[PDB]
Design a binder for these strands. Structure first.
Lengths: 213, 226, 41, 255, 304, 252, 180, 198, 59
RNA sequence: UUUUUGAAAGAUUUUUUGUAUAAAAUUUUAGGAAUAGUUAAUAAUAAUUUAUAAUUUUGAUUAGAUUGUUUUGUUAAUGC
């Protein structure tokens, strides 16, 4: 890209020059934690909440915000759905993917997703747990996927979630992982209320990148 | 948005149309795009008056108690079939008869030969549900010469308005995948004698003089007294 | 509004609408002299 | 049931995620309350950052204020070491000995081909600054992190004599950096953070001991008072402690 | 489904014009910047020629585009005098850099200012590359996509006509132009080009191919267009602005008008805008082939 | 109608309004719906130019630990059909899936058979499409399929394409698009250089046409009850393609 | 988009609607009825302010006399006058540049002003609406044609910038010897 | 005219259910035992049950349980066609089937006729394969039907089945049977296995 | 047309069909109990046309 | 009691972006005092995390009257 490529070019030239004094840290401003707007927003790594019109020094990014696209079984109240669940982890540049996945395990707040040991991938081909992030070329942009130990089975219908829209929830399902809490029979408050997507939302067939109808 | 008519104009509210955008207009309402709807009410209006004096049998009229004279059950078959062909034939009643489920045969709803409209659906597959007359009917669409480059699902198969003139050439068996029709500019060159295009992207036919003399008459250019 | 011509396609039905929007090709031709004298405007 | 509904502790909107992505396409769930944590809640002491080349080369000469004998910093550091050990037998091989104690007010990459001649002119610039100065009293209070947690040190507080001391050390930084084109780490114009490193992870332990000292070992002292002490000597020393414990005294200045 | 969509994570409809595929003028090292200098100087030499003569730079507007104007040779002397200037003021290092960006500007400089053949262009660029390659190591340098684009454009300038003179329906051509020879050259060079694996094609190259096909009167250009461009390039109405000049040449209005209607269907299908030149192309002799070129509201508003 | 900026509304620990994740499933015809129009461009590719990994000589041989380390995303064409090691093969005759390959076959040698292979690990699936016969493409001498010895040999060449992936995976990690390099047909230009060069005479002008165009059959306006003005209705001229202000050819 | 719609007062879409150049005016006794012409949005709250954009003028529907000028022997001047005060330049900025919908009574007025062409609904009942046909429409354009080189200009200087810095008097901005 | 607002979201796109306002209110504790009784009334279950949080269309699983426990009538299967009719009304009339009848499974039913009763049975299976499951009869079904109505000695049925032949599923009727059931010939076809008419 | 909707209590003449709810909306309370299973021998007696036509074969 | 284009204005051949919840000033009643899902930090934590927490006489919490900050009346006029 006309930015990633070029900022890498210059980030590299900067150390292709030894006649360079260092940065004047009092004059290399950080970012402000207090600003105008309303939220505690996070901008980029190179960006300041204020105006800093300078072209500050292109510095190496020590910890990468790595984004791992899990698979969370959601419950619109009309079936279970497959939807994108990125967990953007701030991870260093020197780490082995083994420790990276240990890291994501500690990082998630939905343990719907770290029940069983999983692995990483980029455009398919797995990454080994003995080499590190630059050992393949992981930036914050590496369009990574994540693959569970039961990903090759979700076309199947054995471990597929037994939903009360189309399936029989026995009593033993009423003491197992999602269903003890999912809230089958509506309380006076419908206690844990979930989403709801129509049975006729997308049309007669489901969601695809290409035009079917 | 993407393509409204004449651009974006506002001398009226109606100058855009009954919808401004061939797209949806919400990203949370996917269905509300603009398809070429064909009447659902009136073309699902199956004349019950053909099906009156027939003493029908129900799927719970299976009892010997309810079994009718096979002559009257023949009245029931002819009645139910005339009852479904009242407005027309669904494609699933069209191409259950033609051999090989009509794969390859170029269908057309009645309008698709009338006017500047010139289109067919060089159908490419048909799959039937348990109940027939419903299912998924895919087809290489063909407008004014040009085909899709993959078999699309065919809209309004499951509405009764269809026709087809089965030519034996297009009888495509259950073993050979439908070879897609050629388009008249790309896959086959153009000849000015075999096919001649009905209307181009600019074309609009001269005024039907019965419509000009109806409009004159009403708007009072043609005197109209009883 | 979108006019309801008495020569529209009357949905012979008791539940929705006794008259639908479906022109006789005179309308789609009359509607022409309608929506071009506005685009001249 | 015991607080706000949508707390502003968790009110966060990250803008390195594209637009619309969290709306209708994808979820970015993470833990943002550690990337939005403050140097006061971690320990990042913004050390003067050396550029590429000066970062590639190891510290050869370093200016340091010498600790006197019979200190308070020494004794409180001794009890800190007792508690480091009684806490963990793990962490003894990371602590700096008590005798290697100094006060770092600058590191400098000196070439040996022009070694002693440059050391002499540097000595001129050091004595010509610290001649009129009085003996210096400083404050040690609360530790911090060099190398992103690699180094743990008892910074001298800016609350007693950092003003005078930093006029001095930025003068001698300017002199050693722009006058005699020696390599102090940073810019000729920056002010190197004077520091008292008390423990460190060295490249020879990175492999086994990590790249970040365990903030549990020391964090009880991250904001402890280590003492106010007086000192009289600024010494340029060559980086060889094994001489007699304290690094090779390549020059002294009494105050 | 009706066409190949230009998707985010991957384009599909090819490029309409070829990029120089490089870094910025700012990112160059001092040496390469020297070549960059002459490249920019030549850019403005061509630009002053275009501004000084607007009739002798637009392709095919009059026979003045065919007669080489006075006061171009002298400027070409100054061009090659800067050229040998860099060639001399840099030696071995002049090899180990990228001179394609200036290569193309020399090509276009001599190509527009003077009026050669496209064979002269390929000969000349090969002279350039052998000249630069005999410097240090036994090698040579493959012209890249832009450099080839200059070749094609020389071919398209080569096969050009003075078509709609005030009423002339003719196609006035150059005095003694032979398209057998020309298209022989073109097919040869394009075989060379498409043999090059690193040369990614783009619609700028394809369109000069196509209007070569048309100016050569081959009656095969539209066939080229369909197999090669129409379906898979985010193409533009200049393809068709050229191709109609091939469609008009048939013997029967029956084929002329129908191929045109098919082209316009392509237009509507592949999301192309009939340019004013397209519509006036048609309208010029629409009184013969009766192909309506105006939407109805456009026609009504023009009349009113 | 454009795209808004950020989710400011909901707790992102419960993904709410998110258009669901497309997963191409090998069991059902959607797998082939997506991977089917892709093969045809890689076919035009390997018929125009030489690209390395397409025309292998045999399967890849890798231990079952590293199979998923190189293969996922591996797609190549062998001289004849032969199951790679560690796989099982399942033919498919479903017409609703086969229907797509129409545009494949009507541009290249017609498709003979189609299989889905699954590894004994269950986790690497190879859609394997075996083609048959003389190609429709003027495959170039410096192609990759030209080295596949198919256009060299006479009719009855049964070469076969393989595309490996992990299953249940979205149409993103199907690295079949990265070969969308478009290269034209120069065989078309190859007429004007050999022995047809003196045979073909080109005409540059147009001939004197004294005859106007023969008009189409007279227009009979429609007689069904029309939907209405396809301008005002937002319906593309054929519900297929066109511009909603280029409302040609909808009944009038 | 509301559960129980407001029945006499729905517009087309949305809660704050597009800007519209309305010409309201309070209904009291006809003698005391004059019209607050003003920009504003479609979907307002009950009063005329909360989506009031920019007061645009006032109209007197009651034709008044020349009691500000003397008694001319000039007919068209002695005729009653109907008066209105526009905000011509903020109308141009709203209508032209922000594109606010021009309602039909306000348009009926500004038509009489000379800003906007006489509206759709000033229908001369006494003449029929037109009859479009492609043969005659194209036969005319054939007959009388205007050129690209005369149309592109007007397109530019009528929808895009029109201050032609006269090439000759761009000389006044190209400095002289002390910096030339 | 959208019910999008008046009723909850997931009940967007609910048509052909009557008065959905009950499921909107199905959580409120009185309506809760109201539907506890409606479900026990519809039966099929043993322990208490109501349709789940946000379902108006009853579960597909419970609908299948009742649709299969509802006892198929004709407890008197004697003739081949009564057994075949119980099996066919378990195959193509069990809840949510994906198989649609075969002309080759109409043939067997049609060839189990002893009496006019079975004539009516297989005739109604013809009705369904003709009009319910939208199938194509074989080339030679008119014979399998002509003989099947002779097996009860019916001629009026076959003459009506020839006179109105477009709407039955019989597209190929050779002129021999037309001439036969009129009398234009007094014989329809020579079985060539034994080279004898009839 | 509007007469149809006017029976409904869409409080706004809405062209929507809000079904007016009764208090006794289900059979379990409106007094209707289950279906009476007719005797399978009562529905397994031959029909009369079929009997008169069963007796016309011996002739 | 405060908030946006993503609806719409709204124009093209496609994927197109960073502007929002926050506040700040003013608050009544004769006899005037205690109030409470609590304050801050961690937190996309803690129905049992940490703590010398927060509101108040600069008039708090309870209760009472009361629609909150360009519209009048009087007066030469601060006012009322």
């Amino acid at each position: 890209g006309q930015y990633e490529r070029e900022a890498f070019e210059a980030r590299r030239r900067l150390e292709e020059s030894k006649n360079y004094p260092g940065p004047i840290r009092s004059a290399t401003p950080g970012d402000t934690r207090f600003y105008a707007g309303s939220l505690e927003s996070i901008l980029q790594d190179n960006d300041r909440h204020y105006w800093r019109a300078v072209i500050d020094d292109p510095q190496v990014q020590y910890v990468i915000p790595l984004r791992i696209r899990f698979k969370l079984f959601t419950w619109v109240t009309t079936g279970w759905e497959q939807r994108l669940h990125i967990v953007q982890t701030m991870a260093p540049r020197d780490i082995t993917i083994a420790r990276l996945i240990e890291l994501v395990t500690i990082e998630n707040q939905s343990p719907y997703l770290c029940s069983s040991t999983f692995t990483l991938a980029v455009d398919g081909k797995e990454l080994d747990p003995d080499k590190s992030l630059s050992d393949y070329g992981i930036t914050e942009h590496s369009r990574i996927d994540a693959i569970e130990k039961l990903d090759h089975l979700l076309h199947k219908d054995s471990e597929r979630p037994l939903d009360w829209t189309v399936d029989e929830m026995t009593t033993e399902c009423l003491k197992r992982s999602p269903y003890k809490e999912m809230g089958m029979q509506p309380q006076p408050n419908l206690a844990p209320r979930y989403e709801a997507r129509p049975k006729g939302y997308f049309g007669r067939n489901n969601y695809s990148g290409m035009k079917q109808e | 948005r993407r393509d409204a008519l004449n651009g974006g104009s506002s001398m009226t509210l109606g100058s855009k149309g009954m919808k401004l955008s061939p797209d949806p207009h919400r990203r949370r309402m996917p269905w509300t795009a603009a398809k070429e709807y064909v009447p659902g009410v009136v073309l699902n209006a199956k004349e019950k008056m053909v099906l009156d004096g027939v003493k029908l049998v129900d799927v719970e009229c299976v009892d010997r108690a309810s079994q009718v004279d096979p002559l009257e059950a023949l009245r029931a078959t002819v009645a139910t079939y005339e009852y479904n062909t009242s407005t027309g034939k669904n494609i699933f009643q069209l191409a259950s008869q033609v051999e090989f489920d009509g794969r390859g045969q170029r269908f057309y709803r009645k309008e698709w030969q009338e006017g500047t409209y010139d289109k067919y659906v060089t159908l490419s597959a048909i799959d039937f549900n348990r109940d027939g007359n419903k299912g998924t009917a895919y087809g290489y669409v063909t407008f004014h010469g040009e085909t899709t480059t993959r078999p699309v699902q065919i809209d309004f198969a499951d509405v009764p308005g269809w026709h087809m003139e089965f030519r034996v050439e297009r009888a495509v068996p259950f073993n050979a995948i439908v070879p897609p029709p050629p388009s008249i500019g790309t896959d086959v060159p153009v000849d000015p004698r075999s096919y001649r295009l009905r209307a181009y992207p600019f074309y609009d036919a001269p005024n039907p003089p019965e419509f000009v003399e109806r409009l004159l008459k009403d708007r009072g250019v043609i005197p109209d007294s009883p | 509004r979108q006019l309801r011509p008495y020569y529209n396609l009357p949905s012979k039905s008791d539940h929705g609408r006794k008259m639908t929007g479906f022109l006789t090709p005179y309308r789609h031709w009359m509607w022409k002299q309608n929506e071009l004298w506005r685009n001249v405007h | 049931e015991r607080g706000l509904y949508f707390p502003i502790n968790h009110r966060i909107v990250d803008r390195r995620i594209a637009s619309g992505v969290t709306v209708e396409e994808a979820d970015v769930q993470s833990r943002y309350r550690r990337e939005l944590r403050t140097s006061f809640a971690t320990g990042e002491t913004r050390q003067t950052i050396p550029p590429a080349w000066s970062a590639c080369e190891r510290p050869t000469h370093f200016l340091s204020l010498r600790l006197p004998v019979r200190n308070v910093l020494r004794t409180r550091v001794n009890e800190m070491h007792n508690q480091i050990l009684f806490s963990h037998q793990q962490h003894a091989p990371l602590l700096v000995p008590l005798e290697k104690l100094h006060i770092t007010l600058g590191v400098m990459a000196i070439s040996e081909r022009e070694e002693t001649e440059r050391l002499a002119s540097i000595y001129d610039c050091v004595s010509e600054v610290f001649s009129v100065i009085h003996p210096l009293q400083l404050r040690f209070r609360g530790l911090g992190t060099f190398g992103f947690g690699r180094v743990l040190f008892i910074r001298v507080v800016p609350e007693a004599d950092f003003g005078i001391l930093e006029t001095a050390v930025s003068k001698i930084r300017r002199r050693v950096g722009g006058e005699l084109k020696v390599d102090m780490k940073g810019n000729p114009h920056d002010s190197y953070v004077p520091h008292v490193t008390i423990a460190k992870i060295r490249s020879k332990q990175q492999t086994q001991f990590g790249s970040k000292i365990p903030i549990s070992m020391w964090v009880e002292y991250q904001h402890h008072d280590f003492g106010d002490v007086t000192f009289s000597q600024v010494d340029i020393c060559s980086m060889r402690g094994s001489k007699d414990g304290y690094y090779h005294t390549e020059g002294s200045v009494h105050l | 489904p009706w066409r190949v969509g230009n998707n985010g994570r991957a384009m599909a409809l090819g490029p309409s014009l070829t990029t120089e595929d490089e870094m910025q003028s700012r990112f160059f090292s001092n040496d390469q910047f020297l070549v960059h200098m002459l490249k920019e100087i030549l850019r403005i030499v061509l630009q002053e020629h275009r501004r000084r003569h607007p009739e002798a730079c637009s392709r095919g507007e009059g026979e003045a585009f065919f007669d080489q104007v006075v006061d171009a040779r002298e400027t070409l002397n100054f061009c090659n005098e800067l050229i040998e200037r860099l060639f001399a003021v840099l030696g071995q290092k002049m090899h180990g850099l990228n001179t394609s960006s200036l290569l193309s500007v020399i090509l276009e400089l001599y190509r527009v200012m003077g009026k050669e053949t496209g064979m002269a262009l390929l000969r000349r660029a090969n002279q350039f590359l052998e000249r630069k390659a005999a410097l240090e190591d036994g090698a040579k340098e493959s012209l890249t996509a832009p450099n080839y684009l200059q070749v094609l454009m020389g071919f398209a300038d080569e096969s050009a006509y003075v078509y709609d003179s005030k009423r002339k329906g003719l196609c006035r051509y150059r005095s003694g132009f032979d398209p057998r020879t020309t298209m022989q050259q073109l097919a040869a060079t394009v075989q060379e080009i498409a043999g090059n694996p690193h040369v990614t094609w783009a619609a700028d190259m394809h369109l000069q191919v196509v209007c070569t096909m048309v100016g050569c009167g081959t009656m095969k250009a539209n066939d080229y267009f369909v197999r090669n461009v129409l379906r898979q390039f985010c193409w533009d109405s200049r393809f068709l602005e050229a191709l109609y000049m091939e469609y008009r040449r048939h013997d029967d209005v029956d084929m002329w008008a129908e191929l045109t209607k098919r082209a316009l269907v392509w237009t509507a299908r592949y999301n192309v805008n009939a340019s004013e030149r397209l519509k006036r192309l048609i309208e010029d002799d629409y009184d013969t082939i009766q192909v309506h070129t105006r939407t109805f509201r456009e026609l009504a508003v023009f009349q009113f | 109608a454009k795209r808004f900026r950020y989710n400011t509304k909901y707790p992102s620990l419960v993904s709410y309004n998110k258009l669901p994740w497309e997963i191409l499933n090998h069991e059902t015809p959607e797998f082939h719906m997506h991977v089917a129009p892709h093969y045809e461009q890689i076919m035009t590719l390997a018929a125009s130019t030489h690209v390395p990994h397409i025309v292998g000589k045999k399967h890849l041989e890798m231990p079952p630990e590293h199979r998923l380390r190189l293969l996922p995303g591996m797609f190549y064409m062998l001289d004849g059909d032969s199951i790679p090691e560690g796989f099982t093969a399942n033919r498919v005759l479903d017409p609703t899936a086969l229907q797509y390959y129409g545009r494949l076959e009507s541009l290249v040698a017609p498709v003979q058979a189609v299989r889905m292979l699954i590894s004994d690990d269950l986790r690497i699936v190879c859609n394997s499409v075996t083609l048959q016969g003389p190609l429709q493409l003027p495959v170039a001498s410096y192609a990759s399929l030209a080295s596949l010895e198919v256009v060299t040999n006479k009719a009855s060449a049964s070469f076969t394409l393989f595309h490996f992936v992990r299953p249940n995976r979205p149409p993103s990690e199907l690295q079949l698009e990265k070969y969308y390099i478009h290269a034209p047909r120069a065989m078309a230009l190859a007429e004007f250089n050999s022995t047809s060069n003196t045979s073909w005479e080109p005409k540059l002008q147009a001939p004197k046409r004294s005859k106007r165009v023969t008009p189409l059959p007279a227009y009979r306006p429609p007689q069904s009850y029309l939907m209405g003005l396809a301008e005002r209705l937002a319906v593309v001229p054929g519900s297929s393609f066109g511009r909603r202000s280029l409302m040609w050819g909808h009944w009038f | 988009a509301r559960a129980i719609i407001k029945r006499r007062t729905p517009q087309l879409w949305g809660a704050p609607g597009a800007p519209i150049i309305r010409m309201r005016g309070h209904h009291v006794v006809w003698k005391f009825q004059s019209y607050d012409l003003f920009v504003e949005h479609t979907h307002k709250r009950r009063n005329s302010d909360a989506r009031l954009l920019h007061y645009l003028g006032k109209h007197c529907p009651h034709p008044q006399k020349s009691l500000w000028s003397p008694d001319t022997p000039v007919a068209q001047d002695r005729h009653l006058f109907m008066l209105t005060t526009v905000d011509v330049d903020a109308f141009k900025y709203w209508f032209g540049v922000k594109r606010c919908r021009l309602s039909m009574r306000p348009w009926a007025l500004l038509a009489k002003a000379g800003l906007l062409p006489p509206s759709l609904r000033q229908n001369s009942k006494i003449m029929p609406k037109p009859i479009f046909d492609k043969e005659q429409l194209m036969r005319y354009y054939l007959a009388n044609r205007k050129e690209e080189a005369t149309i592109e200009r007007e397109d530019y200087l009528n929808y895009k910038n029109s201050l032609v810095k006269s090439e000759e008097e761009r000389a006044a901005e190209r400095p002289v010897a002390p910096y030339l | 005219a959208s019910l999008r607002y008046r009723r909850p979201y997931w009940m967007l796109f609910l048509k052909d259910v009557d008065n959905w306002k009950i499921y909107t209110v199905i959580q409120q504790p009185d309506h809760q035992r109201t539907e506890m009784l409606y479900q026990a009334w519809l039966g099929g279950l043993d322990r208490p049950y109501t349709r789940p949080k946000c379902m108006a269309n009853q579960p597909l699983w419970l609908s299948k349980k009742r649709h299969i426990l509802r006892k198929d009538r004709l407890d008197g299967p004697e003739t081949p066609l009564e057994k075949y009719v119980l099996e066919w009304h378990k195959r193509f009339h069990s809840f949510q089937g994906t198989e649609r009848p075969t002309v080759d499974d109409l043939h067997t039913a049609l060839d189990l006729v002893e009496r006019p009763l079975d004539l009516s049975y297989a005739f109604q299976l013809l009705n369904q394969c003709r009009n319910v499951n939208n199938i194509r009869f074989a080339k030679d079904t008119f014979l399998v039907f002509l003989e099947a109505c002779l097996r009860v000695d019916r001629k009026d049925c076959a003459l009506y089945a020839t006179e109105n032949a477009e709407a039955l599923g019989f597209w190929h009727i050779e002129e021999d049977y037309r001439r036969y059931l009129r009398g234009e010939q007094s014989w329809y076809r020579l079985s060539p296995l034994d080279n004898m008419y009839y | 047309e509007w007469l149809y909707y006017k029976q409904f209590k869409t409080i706004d003449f809405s062209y929507r069909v809000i079904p007016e709810l009764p208090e006794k909306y289900r059979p379990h309370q409106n007094g209707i109990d289950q279906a009476p299973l007719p005797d399978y021998r009562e529905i397994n007696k031959m029909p009369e046309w079929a009997r008169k036509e069963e007796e016309r074969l011996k002739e």
